[PDB]
Design an enzyme around this catalytic site. Structure first.
Site, PDB file in Angstrom:
ATOM      1  CG  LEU A 168      -2.082  -1.098   1.197  1.00  0.00           C
ATOM      2  CD1 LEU A 168      -2.495  -1.194   2.457  1.00  0.00           C
ATOM      3  CD2 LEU A 168      -2.790  -1.076   0.112  1.00  0.00           C
ATOM      4  CG  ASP A 169      -0.139   4.806  -1.636  1.00  0.00           C
ATOM      5  OD1 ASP A 169      -1.039   4.157  -1.354  1.00  0.00           O
ATOM      6  OD2 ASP A 169      -0.055   5.620  -2.439  1.00  0.00           O
TER       7      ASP A 169
END
Ligand SMILES: CCCCCCCCCCCCCCCCCC(=O)OC[C@H](COP(=O)([O-])OCC(O)COP(=O)([O-])OC[C@@H](COC(=O)CCCCCCCCCCCCCCCCC)OC(=O)CCCCCCCCCCCCCCCCC)OC(=O)CCCCCCCCCCCCCCCCC
Ligand SMILES: CCCCCCCCCCCCCCCCCC(=O)OC[C@H](COP(=O)([O-])OCC(O)COP(=O)([O-])OC[C@@H](COC(=O)CCCCCCCCCCCCCCCCC)OC(=O)CCCCCCCCCCCCCCCCC)OC(=O)CCCCCCCCCCCCCCCCC
Ligand SMILES: CCCCCCCCCCCCCCCCCC(=O)OC[C@H](COP(=O)([O-])OCC(O)COP(=O)([O-])OC[C@@H](COC(=O)CCCCCCCCCCCCCCCCC)OC(=O)CCCCCCCCCCCCCCCCC)OC(=O)CCCCCCCCCCCCCCCCC
Ligand SMILES: CCCCCCCCCCCCCCCCCC(=O)OC[C@H](COP(=O)(O)OCCN)OC(=O)CCCCCCCCCCCCCCCCC
Ligand SMILES: CCCCCCCCCCCCCCCCCC(=O)OC[C@H](COP(=O)(O)OCCN)OC(=O)CCCCCCCCCCCCCCCCC
Ligand SMILES: CCCCCCCCCCCCCC(=O)SCCNC(=O)CCNC(=O)[C@@H](O)C(C)(C)COP(=O)(O)O
Lengths: 157, 118, 64, 77, 276, 178, 98, 13, 170, 88, 126, 111
Positions: free
Chosen positions: J42-43
Site C-alpha cells: 500500500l502507500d
C-alpha cells in the site's frame, strides 16, 4: 516560592545582554523574545506573544494546563483572561471578517428599510371601522354620568 | 387584495383612506336611514362581563352562547348552534363594514365625476 | 431485551411496531373525522361576498 | 458473544454503489471501499422510503376506523 | 413588537434551514415560533399568543423527546448526516416524530390548527403592516421546509450511522411520556380551543386565498424541500453560495457579535479601568 | 493525543493531513454514501495524478494552492465526531474523571467499605515508590547532552524496572468513569 | 514512518501496566461492604391538603382582601340565590334567520 | 458482573 | 372576621343558580362534595377544638390611644422638650397616614379584581377616593426629604399657603 | 441497557472485517501482524483511507499524528484498546 | 475568492505564506523551540509524578504573569503626553458628560415642576 | 373560594415536597426520580381541578397567602393572580414536566 527579582519581571530591556537575560528568564529564544515598545503604560520586559486565543492551540495535544491549553513554563500572554476558551475567540472562520460584517449589516439595513416600506404601504382589508353602540361605549370606557357626551350615530347599511 | 394595488399603483385620490371612513354624511344617498338596533342592553352586558372589545352589535348572540356554555359546562361540544349564530352575526357585521367601505369608495368616485364635470 | 446486530437489520419487537402504528392510525383517524365533521379547513362557511356586485341602490349613492 | 456475518455476503450488484462503480469505470477509476459501504443497501435496508410512505403511515387503519365510526354514527342516528 | 417578531421568525427559520444538529434545528424552530407569538402580540390578540404558547409547548416537548431518543439510541450522535432509515428501525419514535412535525407545520385538526391558523388569518386580515405579513408567511413556508429537512434526513434515505446497532426500545419510561405528549399534540388544541371562553373575537369573512393560505404555503414548503432533497440525492457537487453560508453560520451574528463585543469590552475594561 | 508533535510537519505529513481533511469535508458536503464514494474516488485520482512530481517547489506550490482551494470551498459546518474537539460530548465526562489521589484523603470508613481494592491500591503505591528512583536514573542516563531533545520517552531498558514517568498515564481516569 | 522500536516498546510496556491497573479497578464480589396501592396519595396529598385548607379558611378568609374573585357572570334568565332577583330576558330578537 | 470502582472524592466530611 | 365592612367594603355576592341543561354529571360538584366531606370536616373539627381551648384560656389586649400633645406650632423654638413631643406625635401621624394610604390602595385593588372587565366604569368612587387621598398625601408629605420632620412639613405647608394666598390676590 | 462493551476479540474481528472489505488487498493473505507497506503493498494515501474507515467503523476520531503512527492491524487494535480502556 | 484575516478570525497556518517559503534558519528555530518545550515538559513531568511530592506545582510562569499584571505596572510606568491625555480623557470625560446629562435633566424637571406643567399623577413615595 | 385556593397552594406544596425530601437525608433509601415523577403527576391532577372550575365559571382569583413587608404606603406582599393564563399554563407545564421527568429518569441513566 523562592521567587527572586532576577526571575521576576523587571524594567524594559535596553541592551542586548538585558534582552538575552529577559529571554532566558521567560524561557524563550533570544530572537523570539520581543518586549512592548515603551508605549506608555507599564509593560516592563514582559514579552509580546503573538496575540492568538487559546482556541487556536492544538486540542489533541495534552497540555499541562489542559483547560488553558498551555504547557508548564511557557510564557503566559498578557491578555490570557481575554484569550481563554471561556472568552474571546480569534480562530479563523470559513468566511472573512469584512464580508461577514458587510453581509450582517446589509441584511439588517435591508430588513429595516423593508419594514419602513411596509409601514408606509400598510396591508389591510376593504372594510370600514368597527362600530360600537352606546356612544362608542362611553360609560363602559369611562365617562362622567353627569356629563352628556356628543352622540355618535352608527347608521344602518 | 386588489384594492391595495389599485390604491398604491393607480391612484390614492379615489381609493379610501381607512382611517377617515366615512368622509361623507351618512344621510347623503339615503332619503331616510334607519338607526342600527342593539339588542343587548348595557346592564346585561355588564352582568355577562363581556370585554369592551366584544360589546358590539352581536353581544346578544355572544350572551346566549356564553349562557349555553355555562349551562352545559360538561360536554363542551354542545353549543355549536349558538357558536354558529354568533359567528354568522359577526360575518353579517363584517359584510356591513365592507358595504360601508364600498359605499365610501363609490362616493369618492362620484365626487371625482362631479369635480371633473365642474 | 434486544440483541445488538453488526451490519444487518435489528430485530424489531412487536410492541414498538404496534404502538407506532396505533399512534399514526389514531392521528389519521382524528384528522379524517374532524375534516368530515367540520370542514372549516377550507373556505370557512360564510361565502365571502364580492363588493362589485353590490347595487348602487342598496349602497345608497345619488346619480347624475 | 457478538458474531460477525460472512464478509463475502457483502456484494455490490443491484445497488447505487453499482451505478457509482459504473460511472467511475467510465473514466477508468475503481472504488475499493464499495463492499465496505455495501451493507447499508442490503436486504434489511434495501427498500426505498418515500415521503408518502412516511406521512401516510397508519392511514389505512385510520381510514378503516373512520369508516367504522361513520357507520356507527349512521346506525345511532 | 410586530416588526421584531416578524424579523426574528424569518431570521431563525433561515438559520434552521441549513442546519445539521437536530437540537439546533428544533431550537431555531422554537425561536421562529416565539417570533410568531410576538407577531400575534403585535396584533391586538394576546389570547391567540397564549394558545400558541400551550400548543407549541406540547409540540416541542414531544419533538425534543423524540430527538433525545434518537440520540441515545445512536450513542450521542446528534447531527442528521449520520442517521437514516429511522422509519424502519425505530418505528415508534419515527411515528411520533412525524406527528410532531405535521402538528408543528399546521396539518389541519391537530393542536397547531387551532392556534397557528387563527394567527395566520389574523395577520392576513389585520391592518398592521405589509413586510411583516410577507416575511411571516415566508417563515411559515420555511417552517414546513425545515420540518421536511428533519423528516427526510432522519426518517428517510439510507442508514449512515456506525454499523454496530444498539437501538434499545420497549422501555416504558421512554415510550409512555412520548405517548402522552403525542396524545396531547393530537387532541389538546381541540379540547382547549373548545373549552376557552370567547375573547378577542375573530374575523371569518375572508377570500379563499386568505383562508387556506397557511395550508397552501405549508404544502408548498414540503414540496419544495422534498425536491431540494432529491436534488441532494443527485450525484453532482454544487457551488457553495453566500446565502447558504449565511444561513449555516447563523447570519454571522454569533461570530461577529460574540467576538467584537467581549473583545472591546474586556480590553477597554483592563487597559483603561485597571491598568491606566 | 498519545504522540507528541515534532518540531515541524514534513511535506508528506502536510499532504496526508490535507487529504484526510478534504475527504472529511467532502463527506460533510455529500452526506450520501454512494455520492461520497464517487467524489472520494475523484479526489484520490487528483492526488494520484499530482503524486509524482520530482520538484519540491512545484509540489509545495501544488500543496499551497490545494489548501487555498480547500479553504475556499470547505464545509462551514463540517461533521465532527462526538468525543472529538469542537463536537458534542467532547469534554463531557471530565466532571466525572476524578484524579485518583483523593483516595488518600478518603476516610477510614470509606476505605473499609472497599478493602480489597485499597489493598491492591497500596500494592500499586509500593510499586511506584520502588520504581521512581530507577526511572529518574534512566532519564538522567538518557543521552541528551545538549541541543536536540524531543518529547518522547524511553522504555524500560533493563529487566525488572518500569518505563519512566509511567504513573500519570497508567493511572489516568477512565474515559467514561460512570 | 510508523513506530520506531523505542516508542513501540514503551507503548507495549505501558499497555501491560494499563491492563493490569484496569483489571485491578474491578470490584470484589463482597464489595462494597455495607454496614399496597394508595398510601403515598394519603401521606403526601391528604395531610398537606388539610394543612393548606386550614391556612386558607382560618387565616385568609379571616383577613379582608386576601381572596378576591370576580363577578360570577350573571346571564339574562336565571335566578340569583341571594335575594330573589331573577332578571328579565332580552327583547324580541327581530333577526331569526340563523 | 463487571462492576468497576468509580473514583469519588472524600464525601465523608 | 376581625375586619368590618365599614373600613373594608365588599358588595354582596350575587351568584346565579345552576341550570344543568345537560344530562352529564358535574365533576366539579362531585369533587366539591367529596372535598367537603374529606378535608373540610376534619379541619373544622380541629379548629373548633382549638377555639374551645382559646375560650378556656381567654385573654385580652388593648389599643393604647395616645392623646394630643401640644404641636410644633404653639411652642417656642429651641425648646427641645416641646419639639421632641411634637416630632414624636408628627411621626406617629405620619405612620398612621401611611397605613391610611395602604388601606385606600387595598380598597382600590379589591375593587379592580371584583369588577374585572367593568373596572373602568364601576370603580369610579374607589378611583376618586384614591386620587383625592393621593393629592392630600402629595400636599402634606411629598417633597419632604429623607430627614422629614414636623418642622419641614410646617415649612412646606406655610410655603403652599403663601402661594395660595398670593394667587388669591388676583 | 444500551451500548454493550467491546473486547479485544471484537476489536480485532471488526478491524480484520474492514480490512478484508478493503477490496484493494488481502486475497486470504491478511494476518494481524501484516504491515501495510512492507508486506501488503500500500502507500500513505491507502493508510489514510484505512484510518478513515476505522474511524467510521468505531464512531470516534483517531488524531492525525497517532493515525500516521499506526501501520499494522495489531497496533490499530492496540490503539482502539488504549483509547476505549479495554480489559478492565 | 481569498480569505482575509483580522485580529479576530486570524490567518490559518494552512494559508500563511511563511509555511511554504521555509528556510533552514526557521527549521533550526523550530527545532530549538521544540527542545525548550521538551525540557520544560520533562521538568514538569518529573515534578508531577514524583511520589514524594506532597504539594502542588508552583508555576513560576504564572507567578511572573501575575506579578507583571499587578505589582510591576507602576514601577514601569513612565508619564508621556499620550498616556497623560488618555488618563485625563478617560478619567474626566465620562464624568463631565454624565454631569451635563444629569444637570440638564434635573434642571428641566425642576423648571417643569416650578411652572406647573409637570404633574405627579400618583407619585406618593419617591 | 376554598377548594380553588387549596388546589393552587397544594400545587405549590406538592412541588416543594421533593425539595425538602432532598434536603432531608432519605434520598439514599427511596427511588427519587420515580417519587418526583409521581409528585409532578399528582400536581398535574390537582391543577386539572381549577382548570375545570375556570372552564365552568371564570372567577379569576387574587390570592395573597402572605404579607412580606409594609414600607411607607407600599405593601410588598405575596400574591397569586390565578387567571386564565395562569391556570391553563400551569396545567400544560405540569403535564409537559411530568413527561420530561419520566423521560429524564430513562435518559439520565448511569449518571
Ligand atoms: C503657554 C502657551 C503654550 C502652551 C502649550 O503649548 O501647552 C502644551 C501642553 C502639552 O505639552 P506637550 O507637548 O504634551 O508636552 C510634551 C513634552 O514636551 C515631552 O514629553 P515628555 O515625555 O518629555 O514629558 C514627560 C511628562 C512629564 O510628566 C508629567 O507631565 C506628569 C503628569 C502631570 C499631570 C498630568 C495630568 C493628566 C493626567 C490625569 C490622569 C487622571 C487623573 C485622575 C482622574 O510630560 C507629559 O506627560 C506631557 C504632558 C504634561 C501636562 C502638564 C499639565 C500641567 C497642568 C495640570 C493641571 C491640572 C490637571 C488635573 C489635575 C487633577 C488632580 C486631581 O498642554 C496642552 O496641550 C494642554 C494643557 C494646557 C494647559 C492646561
Ligand atoms: C417564593 C419563593 C422564594 C424563593 C425563590 C428562590 C429562587 C432562586 C432559587 C435558586 C436555587 C439555587 C440552587 O439550585 O441551589 C442549589 C442548592 C444545593 O443544590 P446541590 O447542587 O444539589 O447542592 C448539594 C451539594 O452539592 C452536595 O450536598 P448533598 O448532595 O449531600 O445535599 C444534601 C443536602 C442536605 O440539606 C441539608 O442538610 C439542609 C440544611 C438546612 C437544614 C435546616 C433544618 C432546620 C430545622 C429547624 C427545626 O444539602 C444541600 O442540598 C445543600 C445544603 C445547604 C442548603 C442550605 C439551605 C438554607 C438553610 C437555612 C436554614 C435556616 C434555619 C433557621 C432556624 O440548593 C439550595 O441551596 C437549596 C434549594 C433551593 C432553595 C430552597 C427551595 C426554594 C424555596 C423554598 C421556599
Ligand atoms: C386533621 C389535621 C388537620 C390539621 C389542621 C391544622 C392544625 C394546626 O396545626 O393548626 C396550627 C396550630 C394553631 O393555629 P393557630 O393558633 O390558629 O395559628 C395562629 C398563628 O400560629 C399565630 O402566629 P404565630 O406567630 O404564633 O406562629 C406562626 C409563626 C411561627 O414562627 C416561629 O415560630 C418563628 C421561627 C422559629 C424557628 C425555629 C427554628 O410563623 C410566622 O410568624 C411566619 C412563618 C413564615 C415561614 C415561611 C417564610 C417564607 C419566607 C419567604 C421569603 C420570600 C418572600 C417573597 C415575597 C414575594 C412578594 C413580595 O399551630 C400553630 O399555629 C403553630 C404552627 C407552627 C409552625 C412552625 C413552622 C413554620 C414557621
Ligand atoms: C414560602 C412562602 C410561604 C407563605 C405562606 C406562609 C404560611 C405560614 C404563615 O403565614 O404563618 C403565619 C400564620 C399567622 O399569620 P398572622 O395571621 O399574620 O399572625 C398574627 C397572629 N399573631 O400562622 C399560621 O397560619 C399558623 C398555621 C399554619 C398551618 C400550616 C400552613 C401551611 C401553608 C401552606 C401554603 C403556603 C404557601 C404556598 C405557596 C408557596 C409558593 C412558594
Ligand atoms: C488636564 C490634563 C491635560 C493633559 C494634556 C495632554 C496633552 C497631550 C497632547 C499630545 O501630545 O497628544 C499626543 C496624542 C498621541 O500622539 P503621540 O504621543 O505622538 O502618539 C502617537 C500615537 N497616537 O495625540 C492624540 O491623541 C491626538 C488627539 C486629537 C484630538
Ligand atoms: C472541500 C473540498 C476540498 C478540495 C481540496 C482539493 C485538493 C486536491 C488537489 C490535489 O490533490 S494537489 C496535491 C499536491 N500534492 C503533491 O503534489 C504531493 C506530491 N509529493 C509527494 O511526495 C507525494 O508522492 C506524496 C503523496 C505526498 C507522498 O506520499 P506517499 O503515498 O507516501
Amino acid at each position: 516560592f523562592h521567587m527572586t527579582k532576577d526571575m521576576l519581571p523587571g524594567s524594559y530591556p535596553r541592551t542586548p545582554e538585558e534582552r538575552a537575560a529577559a529571554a532566558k528568564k521567560y524561557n524563550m529564544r533570544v530572537e523570539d523574545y520581543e518586549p512592548y515598545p515603551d508605549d506608555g503604560m507599564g509593560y516592563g520586559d514582559y514579552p509580546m506573544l503573538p496575540n492568538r486565543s487559546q482556541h487556536e492551540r492544538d486540542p489533541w495535544y495534552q497540555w499541562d494546563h489542559s483547560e488553558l491549553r498551555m504547557n508548564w513554563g511557557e510564557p503566559i500572554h498578557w491578555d490570557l483572561d481575554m484569550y481563554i476558551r471561556n472568552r474571546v475567540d480569534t480562530s479563523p472562520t470559513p468566511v472573512s471578517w469584512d464580508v461577514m460584517c458587510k453581509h450582517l449589516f446589509g441584511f439588517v439595513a435591508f430588513m429595516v428599510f423593508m419594514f419602513w416600506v411596509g409601514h408606509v404601504f400598510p396591508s389591510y382589508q376593504p372594510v370600514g371601522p368597527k362600530q360600537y353602540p352606546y356612544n362608542n361605549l362611553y360609560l363602559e370606557r369611562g365617562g362622567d354620568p353627569t356629563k352628556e357626551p356628543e352622540p355618535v350615530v352608527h347608521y344602518d347599511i | 387584495g386588489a384594492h391595495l394595488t389599485r390604491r398604491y399603483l393607480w391612484d390614492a385620490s379615489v381609493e379610501p383612506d381607512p382611517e377617515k371612513i366615512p368622509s361623507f354624511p351618512p344621510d347623503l344617498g339615503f332619503p331616510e336611514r334607519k338607526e342600527r338596533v342593539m339588542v343587548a342592553t348595557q346592564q346585561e352586558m355588564m352582568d355577562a362581563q363581556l370585554t369592551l372589545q366584544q360589546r358590539d352589535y352581536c353581544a346578544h348572540y355572544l350572551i346566549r352562547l356564553l349562557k349555553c356554555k355555562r349551562d352545559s359546562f360538561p360536554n363542551f361540544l354542545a353549543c355549536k348552534h349558538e357558536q354558529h349564530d354568533w359567528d354568522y352575526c359577526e360575518h353579517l357585521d363584517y359584510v356591513k363594514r365592507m358595504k360601508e367601505f364600498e359605499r365610501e369608495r363609490r362616493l369618492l368616485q362620484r365626487k371625482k365625476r362631479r369635480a371633473l364635470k365642474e | 431485551h434486544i440483541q445488538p446486530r453488526y451490519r444487518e437489520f435489528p430485530q424489531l419487537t412487536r410492541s414498538q411496531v404496534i404502538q407506532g402504528e396505533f399512534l399514526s392510525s389514531l392521528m389519521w383517524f382524528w384528522i379524517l373525522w374532524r375534516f368530515w365533521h367540520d370542514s372549516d379547513a377550507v373556505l370557512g362557511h360564510f361565502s365571502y361576498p364580492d363588493p362589485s356586485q353590490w347595487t348602487d341602490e342598496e349602497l345608497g349613492i345619488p346619480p347624475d | 458473544k457478538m458474531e460477525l456475518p460472512d464478509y463475502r455476503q457483502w456484494k455490490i450488484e443491484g445497488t447505487p454503489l453499482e451505478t457509482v462503480q459504473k460511472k467511475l469505470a467510465a473514466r477508468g477509476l475503481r472504488d475499493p471501499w464499495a463492499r465496505n459501504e455495501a451493507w447499508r443497501y442490503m436486504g434489511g435496508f434495501a427498500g426505498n422510503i418515500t415521503f408518502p410512505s412516511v406521512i401516510l403511515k397508519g392511514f389505512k387503519w385510520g381510514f378503516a376506523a373512520f369508516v367504522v365510526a361513520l357507520g356507527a354514527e349512521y346506525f345511532l342516528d | 413588537m410586530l416588526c421584531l417578531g416578524a424579523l426574528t421568525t424569518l431570521f431563525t427559520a433561515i438559520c434552521a434551514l441549513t442546519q445539521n444538529d437536530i437540537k439546533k434545528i428544533i431550537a431555531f424552530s422554537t425561536s421562529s415560533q416565539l417570533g410568531l407569538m410576538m407577531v400575534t402580540l403585535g396584533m391586538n390578540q394576546p389570547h391567540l399568543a397564549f394558545l400558541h404558547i400551550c400548543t407549541h409547548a406540547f409540540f416541542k416537548a414531544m419533538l425534543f423527546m423524540c430527538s433525545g431518543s434518537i440520540i441515545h439510541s445512536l450513542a450521542d450522535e446528534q447531527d442528521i448526516r449520520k442517521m437514516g432509515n429511522i422509519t424502519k428501525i425505530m418505528p415508534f419514535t419515527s411515528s411520533c416524530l412525524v406527528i410532531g412535525s405535521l402538528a408543528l407545520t399546521g396539518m389541519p385538526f391537530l393542536t397547531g390548527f387551532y392556534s397557528k391558523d387563527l394567527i395566520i388569518e389574523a395577520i392576513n386580515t389585520c391592518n398592521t403592516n405589509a413586510w411583516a405579513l410577507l416575511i411571516t408567511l415566508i417563515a411559515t413556508s420555511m417552517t414546513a421546509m425545515y420540518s421536511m429537512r428533519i423528516i427526510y434526513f432522519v426518517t428517510m434515505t439510507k442508514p449512515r450511522f456506525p454499523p454496530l446497532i444498539s437501538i434499545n426500545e420497549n422501555d416504558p419510561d421512554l415510550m409512555n411520556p412520548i405517548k402522552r405528549l403525542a396524545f396531547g399534540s393530537i387532541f389538546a388544541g381541540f379540547v382547549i380551543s373548545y373549552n376557552i371562553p370567547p375573547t378577542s373575537i375573530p374575523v371569518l369573512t375572508m377570500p379563499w386565498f386568505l383562508k387556506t393560505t397557511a395550508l397552501i404555503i405549508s404544502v408548498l414548503g414540503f414540496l419544495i424541500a422534498l425536491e431540494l432533497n432529491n436534488l441532494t440525492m443527485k450525484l453532482s457537487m454544487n457551488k457553495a453560495n453566500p446565502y447558504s453560508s449565511f444561513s449555516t453560520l447563523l447570519g454571522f451574528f454569533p461570530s461577529i457579535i460574540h467576538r467584537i463585543t467581549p473583545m472591546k469590552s474586556l480590553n477597554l475594561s483592563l487597559k483603561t479601568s485597571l491598568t491606566l | 493525543a498519545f504522540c507528541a508533535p515534532p518540531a515541524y510537519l514534513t511535506h508528506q505529513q502536510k499532504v496526508l493531513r490535507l487529504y484526510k481533511r478534504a475527504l472529511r469535508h467532502l463527506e460533510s458536503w455529500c452526506i450520501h454514501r454512494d455520492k461520497y464514494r464517487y467524489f472520494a474516488c475523484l479526489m484520490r485520482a487528483r492526488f494520484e495524478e499530482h503524486k509524482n512530481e520530482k520538484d519540491m517547489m512545484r509540489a509545495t506550490q501544488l500543496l499551497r494552492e490545494a489548501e487555498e482551494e480547500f479553504w475556499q470551498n470547505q464545509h462551514p459546518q463540517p461533521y465532527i465526531f462526538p468525543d472529538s474537539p469542537g463536537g458534542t460530548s467532547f469534554e463531557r465526562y471530565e466532571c466525572y474523571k476524578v484524579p485518583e489521589w483523593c483516595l488518600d484523603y478518603w476516610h477510614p470508613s470509606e476505605k473499609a467499605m472497599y478493602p480489597d481494592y485499597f489493598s491492591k491500591r497500596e500494592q500499586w503505591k509500593k510499586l511506584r515508590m520502588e520504581s521512581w528512583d530507577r526511572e529518574v536514573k534512566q532519564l538522567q542516563e538518557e543521552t541528551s547532552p545538549d541541543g536536540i531533545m524531543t518529547e518522547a520517552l524511553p522504555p524500560a531498558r533493563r529487566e525488572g524496572d518500569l518505563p519512566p514517568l509511567w504513573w500519570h498515564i497508567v493511572t489516568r481516569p477512565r474515559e467514561r468513569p460512570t | 514512518s510508523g513506530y520506531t522500536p523505542d516508542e513501540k516498546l514503551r507503548l507495549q510496556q505501558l499497555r501491560e501496566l494499563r491492563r493490569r491497573w484496569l483489571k485491578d479497578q474491578e470490584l470484589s464480589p463482597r464489595e462494597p461492604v455495607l454496614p399496597r396501592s394508595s398510601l403515598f396519595a394519603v401521606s403526601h396529598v391528604l395531610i398537606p391538603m388539610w394543612f393548606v385548607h386550614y391556612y386558607v379558611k382560618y387565616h385568609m378568609a379571616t383577613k379582608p382582601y386576601t381572596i378576591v374573585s370576580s363577578k360570577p357572570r350573571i346571564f339574562p334568565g336565571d335566578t340569583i340565590l341571594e335575594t330573589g332577583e331573577v332578571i328579565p330576558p332580552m327583547r324580541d330578537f327581530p333577526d331569526q334567520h340563523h | 458482573g463487571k462492576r468497576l470502582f468509580v473514583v469519588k472524592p472524600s464525601l465523608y466530611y | 372576621d376581625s375586619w368590618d365592612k365599614d373600613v373594608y367594603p365588599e358588595p354582596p355576592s350575587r351568584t346565579p343558580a345552576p341550570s344543568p341543561q345537560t344530562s352529564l354529571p358535574n365533576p366539579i360538584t362531585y369533587l366539591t362534595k367529596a372535598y367537603d366531606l374529606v378535608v373540610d370536616w376534619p379541619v373544622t373539627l380541629v379548629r373548633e377544638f382549638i377555639e374551645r381551648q382559646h375560650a378556656k384560656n381567654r385573654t385580652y389586649y388593648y389599643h393604647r390611644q395616645y392623646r394630643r400633645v401640644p404641636d410644633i406650632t404653639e411652642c417656642k423654638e429651641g425648646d427641645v422638650l416641646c419639639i421632641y413631643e411634637a416630632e414624636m406625635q408628627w411621626r406617629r401621624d405620619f405612620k398612621v397616614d401611611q397605613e391610611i394610604m395602604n388601606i385606600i390602595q387595598e380598597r382600590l385593588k379589591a375593587c379592580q379584581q371584583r369588577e374585572g372587565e367593568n373596572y373602568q366604569q364601576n370603580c369610579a368612587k374607589e378611583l376618586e377616593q384614591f386620587t383625592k387621598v393621593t393629592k392630600a398625601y402629595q400636599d402634606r408629605y411629598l417633597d419632604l426629604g429623607a430627614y422629614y420632620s414636623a418642622r419641614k412639613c410646617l415649612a412646606k405647608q406655610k410655603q403652599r399657603m403663601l402661594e395660595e394666598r398670593k394667587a388669591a390676590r388676583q | 441497557s444500551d451500548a454493550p462493551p467491546l473486547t479485544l476479540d471484537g476489536i480485532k474481528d471488526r478491524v480484520l472485517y474492514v480490512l478484508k472489505l478493503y477490496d484493494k488487498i488481502d486475497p486470504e493473505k491478511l494476518s494481524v501482524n501484516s504491515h501495510f507497506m512492507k508486506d501488503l503493498g500500500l502507500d500513505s494515501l491507502d493508510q489514510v483511507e484505512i484510518i478513515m474507515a476505522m474511524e467510521d467503523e468505531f464512531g470516534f476520531e483517531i488524531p492525525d499524528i497517532d493515525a500516521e503512527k499506526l501501520m499494522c492491524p495489531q497496533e490499530i487494535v492496540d490503539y482502539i484498546a488504549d483509547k476505549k480502556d479495554v480489559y478492565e | 475568492s481569498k480569505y482575509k484575516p483580522a485580529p479576530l478570525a486570524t490567518l490559518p497556518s494552512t494559508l500563511d505564506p511563511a509555511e511554504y517559503d521555509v528556510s533552514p534558519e526557521t527549521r533550526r528555530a523550530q527545532v530549538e523551540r521544540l527542545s525548550i518545550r521538551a525540557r520544560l515538559k520533562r521538568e514538569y513531568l518529573l515534578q508531577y509524578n514524583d511520589p514524594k511530592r506532597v504539594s502542588h506545582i508552583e508555576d513560576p510562569a504564572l507567578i511572573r504573569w501575575t506579578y507583571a499584571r499587578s505589582a510591576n505596572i507602576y514601577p514601569n510606568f513612565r508619564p508621556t503626553p499620550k498616556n497623560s491625555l488618555l488618563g485625563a480623557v478617560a478619567g474626566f470625560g465620562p464624568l463631565i458628560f454624565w454631569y451635563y446629562v444629569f444637570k440638564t435633566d434635573r434642571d428641566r424637571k425642576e423648571r417643569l415642576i416650578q411652572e406647573g406643567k409637570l404633574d405627579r399623577k400618583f407619585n406618593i413615595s419617591y | 373560594m376554598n377548594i380553588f385556593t387549596t388546589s393552587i397552594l397544594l400545587i405549590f406544596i406538592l412541588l416543594l415536597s421533593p425539595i425538602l425530601i432532598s434536603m432531608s437525608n432519605l434520598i439514599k433509601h427511596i427511588n427519587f426520580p420515580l417519587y418526583t415523577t409521581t409528585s409532578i403527576k399528582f400536581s398535574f391532577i390537582i391543577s386539572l381541578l381549577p382548570l375545570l372550575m375556570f372552564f365552568h365559571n371564570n372567577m379569576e382569583y387574587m390570592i395573597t397567602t402572605w404579607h412580606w413587608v409594609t414600607m411607607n404606603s407600599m405593601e410588598l406582599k405575596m400574591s397569586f393572580k390565578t387567571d386564565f393564563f395562569s391556570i391553563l399554563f400551569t396545567s400544560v407545564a405540569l403535564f409537559v414536566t411530568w413527561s420530561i421527568m419520566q423521560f429524564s429518569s430513562w435518559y439520565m441513566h448511569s449518571d
